[PDB]
Design a protein around this ligand. Structure first.
Ligand SMILES: Nc1ncnc2c1ncn2[C@@H]1O[C@H](COP(=O)(O)OP(=O)(O)O)[C@@H](O)[C@H]1O
Ligand SMILES: [Mg+2]
Ligand SMILES: [Mg+2]
Length: 389
């Protein structure tokens, strides 16, 4: 009973639905992004046994990596974390600064275990699509009969987000920030803000570019109010490269995601998982650039940056060391890791990637991306899925 994809009719009023629900990036410069012309059908057993339980287990494995890495300067060095920040990252972990969310990327292997490619443990997007828009799609699809009436979906993300913001409630305003000139980032953060407000959390939005510093480096908003806690859709590694990075050592602001997530939002995680859990069914052999390769001669392999996103500067090599595929990106100068190669599955002419969501520590949903090559990148489309049987 294999997982499959099938065509489905696009809703005749899709553009109106997107507009009415704040989905202002379902089309991106006149290219389809949200793609409901097809859908993936999983069984409940595939969800529970191959996606949900392994995601939860992998997150526990990642927390063990954090606990070991904060104690080991050689590991922190391999992770390319600047030594200025080792103490504050270690303290962030020791205080167990609260986490909100993270998203793993998986290569689907049919009846075999999924393979973990990376852990977007800091600033994952495709959240609005995964938590909200595809659930509305499911409700419409069940009633129009294009999928079974009793179809489900692997998706409790919104409920877990709201409940997590409830656990983190403070009388102090919770700031939300992202950079300018990206509707996707703004709407991802707006969605999180909406979830926080549904839990009773007073929330304020400010652009990263509008953040100010008062005397002595106190973080302030545009009205010179002191910012005590903020969610930032902005990479931890960029915060630590910023000229104002050293201010993080004072721990005067609460950040979500917290500083200890810098160990996980880091492709150096993949060699560390392979080191500490060799042979785990969901892991691929992986090593830092310069270490002895952990594949045999002839096998294909992947090189990718430690810090990157959206497929930037991924190279797939064959076992004669020729380039199989390569993606442009702004990360050409970052240090690199290697990983054994597991091609994404191909459906029609698209290559399919599973993003599996964690909220705090709970596996609670998934969203699918399709793209035209083996390397998921900036042209990828989001595709709904459902559960049947
Ligand atoms: N070990 C691998 N085997 C096969 N494909 C890979 C591997 N690692 C990455 N890829 C491809 O490259 C894409 C991007 O890699 P990923 O680790 O998700 O980094 P990011 O999305 O942060 O650039 C993946 O979605 C997949 O298409
Ligand atoms: Mg990815
Ligand atoms: Mg990524």
């Amino acid at each position: 009973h294999h997982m499959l994809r099938h065509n489905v009719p696009v809703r005749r009023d899709l553009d109106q639905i997107a507009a009415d629900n704040g989905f202002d990036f379902h089309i991106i410069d006149n290219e389809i992004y949200w793609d409901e012309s097809r859908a993936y059908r999983f069984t409940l057993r595939q969800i529970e046994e191959q996606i949900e339980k392994p995601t939860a287990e992998l997150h526990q494995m990642c927390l063990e990596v954090v606990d070991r890495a904060v104690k080991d300067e050689e590991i922190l060095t391999q992770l390319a974390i600047p030594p200025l920040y080792w103490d504050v990252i270690a303290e962030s972990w020791r205080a167990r600064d609260p986490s909100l969310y993270g998203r793993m990327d998986f290569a689907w292997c049919g009846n075999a275990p999924v393979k973990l490619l990376e852990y977007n443990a800091d600033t994952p997007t495709s959240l609005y699509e995964s938590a909200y828009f595809q659930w509305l799609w499911l409700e419409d699809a069940r009633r129009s009969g294009i999928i079974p009436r009793d179809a489900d979906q692997y998706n409790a993300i919104q409920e877990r987000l709201i409940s997590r913001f409830s656990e983190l409630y403070s009388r102090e305003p919770f700031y939300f920030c992202c950079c300018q000139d990206t509707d996707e980032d703004r709407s991802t953060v707006l969605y999180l803000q909406d979830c926080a407000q549904q839990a009773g959390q007073e929330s304020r939005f400010i652009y990263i570019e509008d953040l100010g510093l008062g005397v002595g480096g106190v973080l302030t908003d545009l009205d010179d109010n002191v910012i005590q806690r903020a969610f930032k859709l902005y990479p931890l590694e960029w915060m630590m490269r910023d000229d104002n990075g050293p201010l993080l050592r004072k721990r005067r602001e609460q950040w979500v995601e917290p500083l200890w997530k810098s160990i996980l939002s880091n492709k150096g995680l993949m060699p560390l998982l392979w080191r500490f859990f060799p042979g785990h069914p969901n892991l691929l052999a992986s090593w830092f650039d310069g270490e002895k390769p952990q594949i045999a001669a002839g096998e294909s392999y992947v090189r990718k940056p430690i810090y990157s996103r959206e497929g930037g500067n991924v190279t797939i090599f064959d076992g004669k060391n020729n380039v199989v595929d390569h993606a442009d990106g702004d990360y050409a100068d970052e240090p690199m890791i290697y990983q054994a190669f597991q091609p994404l599955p191909r459906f029609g002419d698209s290559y399919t990637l599973i993003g599996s969501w964690i909220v705090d520590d709970e596996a609670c949903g998934m969203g699918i991306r399709e793209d035209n090559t083996l390397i998921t990148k900036d042209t990828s489309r989001f595709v709904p899925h459902y559960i049947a049987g």
